[PDB]
Design a protein around this ligand. Structure first.
Ligand SMILES: [Mg+2]
Ligand SMILES: [Mg+2]
Ligand SMILES: [Mg+2]
Ligand SMILES: [Mg+2]
Ligand SMILES: [Mg+2]
Ligand SMILES: [Mg+2]
Ligand SMILES: [Mg+2]
Ligand SMILES: [Mg+2]
Ligand SMILES: [Mg+2]
Ligand SMILES: [Mg+2]
Ligand SMILES: [Mg+2]
Ligand SMILES: [Mg+2]
Ligand SMILES: [Mg+2]
Ligand SMILES: [Mg+2]
Ligand SMILES: [Zn+2]
Lengths: 55, 215, 25, 81, 97, 125, 222, 129
RNA sequence: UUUUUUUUUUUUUUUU
RNA sequence: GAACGAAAGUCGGAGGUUCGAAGACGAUCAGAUACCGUCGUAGUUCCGACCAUAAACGAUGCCGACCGGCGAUGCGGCGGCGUUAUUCCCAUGACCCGCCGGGCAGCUUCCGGGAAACCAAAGUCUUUGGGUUCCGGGGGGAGUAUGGUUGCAAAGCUGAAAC
């Protein structure tokens, strides 16, 4: 889920260390984000129906 | 006035409920409503000025046009029964149970209201909505007791609100007066529902006991 | 040091200096 | 407040409170413009016209509002004799 | 600052109250400032009542009690676990159940 | 240590509140009903959810819960709200209470219908 | 570019454009909540200055936690000014927050004459006072074209408040702008609260914006 | 003990105005107080009033409009020669639009505005606005 | 029941 | 200018239970001359005189007025076919209910204040003036020196500068 990026920058002051980490969004289909959901983030389905009376 | 004046059926129902007696302590701004000390150290509220504040409170409730702007609160389980039926009785917005402080002030929460008038049951039980009134510019009609303070109260109706019967009779008669001032039923006709809905049902056990004896 | 005992030491010094003055009037 | 030109100088005229004749401030959020409706004669039906009573902040906080609304309605005659 | 409105004790009209000795460290303390209690005790251990109830001569009608006005000063009563501290709004309290 | 997590109790209350109907008092059936009506990423989470769902079912089948009520409890509480007999909004239409309210109804213009009689000593409180 | 995103029913009145000016809101002292309401009523209120940004320190278990406290004073030059104090852990965050809080706390300023009525007022209506902490700021009317003789911070604040001429008299820790600017703000806020013997006329009581446009409110809720 | 009863009257007036009550009781009475309230009434800052005539010393009850910000007494009753009013003007009056000063002239208890026309001057009782 | 002391100075603050 | 003014202290007379500065030992500690324990001096007591100081504290000069409420409690006064003790009216007795005056106080409050803690006064103050006495002007040096004055003495009163 977390894409680590660690780079160096050389300047006249010396060096600068940068760390960038980006949590990818959960997209269930496609190349955008990962396809497994979070184990904490649990999705349910909305309610089913209504009518059910006898005949 | 001469047509909104009291009738004997009203005072018969008042004396049947027991609203004439009150507590043992006075607020100093509650002197003008109440009448006389009693033998059992009990202060008797009049009914003459009691009807007058109910009349003015009814006029103020009919004054706001959209009845959904009427917001009605009761915290204690006496008036928790009455408020829910009183709200659908005219148009009002019921809020009982826990008041959820920050009802009127912050707007990040979806449970947010912008009323133009508030009616409560007990100020000492509703110390929080009366405090929240002063930020959002809304008046107050309060069913005040004999020993209840009057901070942030605009129209105070003198009554007893310990017992559930007097509470329910007041909510019944207030709805009864507001709907007539709207013009649903004329004055010379009884109101079509009976105040037990507005009173309060406790542990059903005794309710279904009455049902089981009346089978 | 308390102000109490500071006053006591200055008081004792005052008595010593008074004895020195009375020893050489 | 008028100048020598007779122009109405000020931006807005604040509500002088009907209780105790004191100015409702620009941020006195305890103040309220109470409205009470007119009633017909013996017919007893609603009139679409209403009367306006202003209550300011410190009066509401102290409790002169309960006395004040009845004493303002009584001089107007809308409550009793 | 004032930590207390009453300055601890209860002298307001007076100019001077008698001192009374404490029991533990025997310091004299003005008798409203002192921590006052009153021990009503069965003179026997309540577990040891039954041993004397066995071999008692009479029909258990003699039940002696020992009454002591017990009188502490604050500097040792707190060490002796009576007057344990509280909060700002909890200092406004009265009699414990 | 069954102190179960906020997300577990949250999803369990959502499950029972949406679908009270399919869930029964049998744990192994309710476990498989959870996979039909929800998406649970893991089997330990399935078991924890289903266990607390059955423990909630043994309360809801027993009585109403302060957490959430089903539609049946809603209809029964609405019935208990609007049950109206014709008994005691009014008594027998003379109620006797007080000589002071007798003086009051002498003052206010009414008929002075019938009796009102107590006399008391002065031991209030 | 982004949409206004209404809530709280006064903004729905604003989007229906049914309240003309901001004076209608100050007639009834309705509580203002969203910030761009005054942007819709005033498109030329961008005139502001950051008064001071100062750090405050919280001594926590490892080291001192720093967070910056930004003061922003905004104002239209017609007699509307706002003052905003906002503390946050970032400069740009605290500046944006202090701008939004000044937008919320904008209030009008009464402006009177020195003593001759001739026209287009230039000064405070009387000797008003304002107090915040131990700072007393006293505003005294001044003759025409005098300028404002004061400290630089309330000179900026009264330069925004449409005052051209004023005398000031401070007392207290004037070194602390956190109380001093709020004292000057309370002083210029009390100007409509202070009575005057040319404002004795009984009120007219025009209708509420709510009761005036109930139909818009009903159709927007529904 | 009891001295300068004008101050005792006007501090009661001030406390009643700050509280917001309707009418005040003042236990002493002076011709000074009566003419002072006459000036205040004629300029409109108070309402109608009424003097309960005790045989010993009466009691004044004043209906209040609600406009009175502040009334008060200058303590030692200073002399004021004319062309020395403007000190007291800048020092006491809140603005150049309102505010009044009650001088004591030889021709009666006068006002700050009537005094400059009548060209008298005299002693200051107090001020109100 | 004990239970004392422990160099000296090193530490500065932003634009939107 | 004057009268009282706790404890301690000083000077006579009487006695001397307890406590107990000083002092003595025994223990504890590295050291105790300190806390702990044993003994025990002056004083603690009373009668005469002096000394005039204290966290002498509500750390809030005195008089006067105005500005919210509530239940108390102490002392008078008043009202109340409520109750109860005499013997049998009668009174004051004892509770209960309520009012008035001023006293010690308390809970509450956005009365208004203040830097706040908090206060019905520490409020009625930049809208600053009811009358009046004593006072403070960065900390130290210092309530020290030095003069005068009181005191038997201890010391008290007045009281500065260099730096
Ligand atoms: Mg301390
Ligand atoms: Mg003392
Ligand atoms: Mg400085
Ligand atoms: Mg060493
Ligand atoms: Mg002595
Ligand atoms: Mg000696
Ligand atoms: Mg000798
Ligand atoms: Mg001898
Ligand atoms: Mg001994
Ligand atoms: Mg002294
Ligand atoms: Mg004094
Ligand atoms: Mg003194
Ligand atoms: Mg008595
Ligand atoms: Mg007697
Ligand atoms: Zn002890």
């Amino acid at each position: 889920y977390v894409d680590t990026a660690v780079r160096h920058v050389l300047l006249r002051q010396g060096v600068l260390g940068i760390k960038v980490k980006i949590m990818l969004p959960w997209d269930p289909t496609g190349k955008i984000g990962p396809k497994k959901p979070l184990p904490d983030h649990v999705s349910i389905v909305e309610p089913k129906d209504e009518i059910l009376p006898t005949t | 006035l001469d047509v909104l004046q009291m009738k004997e059926e009203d005072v018969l129902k008042f004396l049947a409920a027991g609203t004439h007696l009150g507590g043992t302590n006075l607020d100093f701004q509650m002197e003008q409503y109440i009448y006389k000390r009693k033998s059992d150290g009990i202060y008797i509220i009049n009914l003459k000025r009691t009807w007058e504040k109910l009349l003015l409170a009814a006029r103020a409730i009919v004054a706001i046009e959209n009845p959904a702007d009427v917001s009605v609160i009761s915290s204690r389980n006496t008036g928790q029964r009455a408020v829910l039926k009183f709200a659908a009785a005219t148009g009002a917005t019921p809020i009982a149970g826990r008041f959820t402080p920050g009802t009127f002030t912050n707007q990040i929460q979806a449970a947010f209201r912008e009323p133009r008038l508030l009616v409560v049951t007990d100020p000492r039980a509703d110390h929080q909505p009366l405090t929240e009134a002063s930020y959002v510019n809304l008046p107050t009609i309060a069913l005040c007791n004999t020993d209840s303070p009057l901070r942030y109260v605009d129209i105070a109706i003198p009554c007893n609100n310990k017992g559930a019967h007097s509470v329910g009779l007041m909510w019944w008669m207030l709805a009864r007066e507001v709907l007539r001032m709207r013009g649903t039923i004329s004055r010379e006709h009884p109101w079509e529902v009976m105040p037990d809905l507005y009173f309060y049902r406790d542990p059903e056990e005794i309710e279904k006991e009455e049902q089981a004896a009346a089978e | 040091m308390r102000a109490k005992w500071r006053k006591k030491r200055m008081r004792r010094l005052k008595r010593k200096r008074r004895k020195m003055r009375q020893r050489s009037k | 407040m008028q100048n020598d030109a007779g122009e109405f100088v000020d931006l807005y005229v604040p509500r002088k409170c009907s209780a105790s004749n004191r100015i409702i401030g620009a941020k006195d959020h305890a103040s309220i413009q109470m409205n009470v409706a007119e009633v017909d004669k013996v017919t007893g039906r609603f009139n679409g016209q209403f009367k306006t009573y202003a209550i300011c902040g410190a009066i509401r906080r102290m409790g002169e509002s309960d006395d004040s609304i009845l004493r303002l309605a009584k001089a107007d005659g809308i409550v009793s004799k | 600052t004032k930590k207390r409105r009453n300055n601890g004790r209860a002298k307001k009209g007076r100019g001077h109250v008698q001192p009374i000795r404490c029991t533990n460290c025997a310091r004299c303390v003005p008798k409203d400032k002192a921590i006052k209690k009153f021990v009503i005790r069965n003179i026997v251990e309540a577990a040891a009542v039954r041993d004397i109830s066995e071999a008692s001569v009479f029909d258990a009608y003699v039940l002696p009690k020992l009454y002591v006005k017990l009188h502490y000063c604050v500097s040792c009563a707190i060490h002796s676990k009576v007057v344990r501290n509280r909060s700002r709004e909890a200092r406004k309290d009265r009699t414990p159940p | 240590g069954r102190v179960r997590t906020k997300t577990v109790k949250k999803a369990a209350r959502v499950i029972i509140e949406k679908y009270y109907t399919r869930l029964g008092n049998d744990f192994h059936t309710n476990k498989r009903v959870c996979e039909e009506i929800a998406i649970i990423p893991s089997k330990k989470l399935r078991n924890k959810i289903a266990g607390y769902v059955t423990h909630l079912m043994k309360r809801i089948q027993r009585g109403p819960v302060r957490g959430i009520s089903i539609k049946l409890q809603e209809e029964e509480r609405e019935r208990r709200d609007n049950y109206v007999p014709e008994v005691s909004a009014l008594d027998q239409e003379i109620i006797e209470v007080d000589p002071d309210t007798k003086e009051m109804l002498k003052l206010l213009d009414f008929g002075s219908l019938s009796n009102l009689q107590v006399t008391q000593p002065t031991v209030g409180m | 570019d982004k949409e206004w995103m209404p809530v709280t029913k006064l903004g729905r009145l604003v989007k229906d454009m049914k309240i003309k000016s901001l004076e209608e809101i100050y007639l009834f002292s309705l509580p203002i909540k969203e910030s761009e309401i005054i942007d819709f009523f005033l498109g030329a209120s961008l005139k502001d200055e950051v008064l001071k940004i100062m750090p405050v320190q919280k001594q926590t278990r490892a080291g001192q936690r720093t967070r910056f406290k930004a003061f922003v004073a905004i104002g239209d030059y017609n007699g509307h000014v706002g003052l905003g104090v906002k503390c946050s852990k970032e400069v740009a965050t605290a500046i944006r927050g202090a701008i939004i809080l000044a937008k919320l706390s904008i209030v009008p300023v009464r402006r009177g004459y020195w003593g001759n009525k001739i026209g287009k007022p230039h000064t405070v209506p009387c000797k008003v006072t304002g107090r915040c902490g131990s700072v007393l700021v006293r505003l005294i009317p001044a003759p025409r074209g005098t300028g404002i003789v004061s400290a630089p911070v309330p000179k900026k604040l009264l330069m925004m408040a449409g005052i051209d001429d004023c005398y000031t008299s401070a007392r207290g820790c004037t070194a602390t702008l956190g109380n001093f600017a709020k004292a000057t703000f309370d002083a210029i806020s009390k100007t409509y609260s202070y009575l005057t013997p040319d404002l004795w006329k009984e009120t007219v009581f025009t209708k509420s914006p709510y009761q005036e446009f109930t139909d818009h409110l009903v159709k927007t809720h529904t | 003990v009891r001295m300068n009863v004008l101050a005792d009257a006007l501090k009661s007036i001030n406390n009643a105005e700050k509280r917001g009550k309707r009418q005040v009781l003042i236990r002493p009475c002076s011709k000074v107080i009566v003419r002072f309230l006459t000036v205040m009434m004629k300029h409109g800052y108070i309402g109608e009033f009424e003097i309960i005539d005790d045989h010993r010393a009466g009691k004044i009850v004043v209906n209040l409009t609600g406009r009175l910000n502040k009334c008060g007494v200058i303590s030692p009753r200073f002399d004021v020669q004319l062309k020395d009013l403007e000190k007291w003007q800048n020092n006491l009056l809140p603005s150049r639009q309102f505010g009044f000063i009650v001088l004591t002239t030889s021709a009666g208890i006068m006002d700050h505005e009537e005094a400059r026309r009548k060209h008298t001057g005299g002693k200051i009782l107090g001020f109100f606005f």
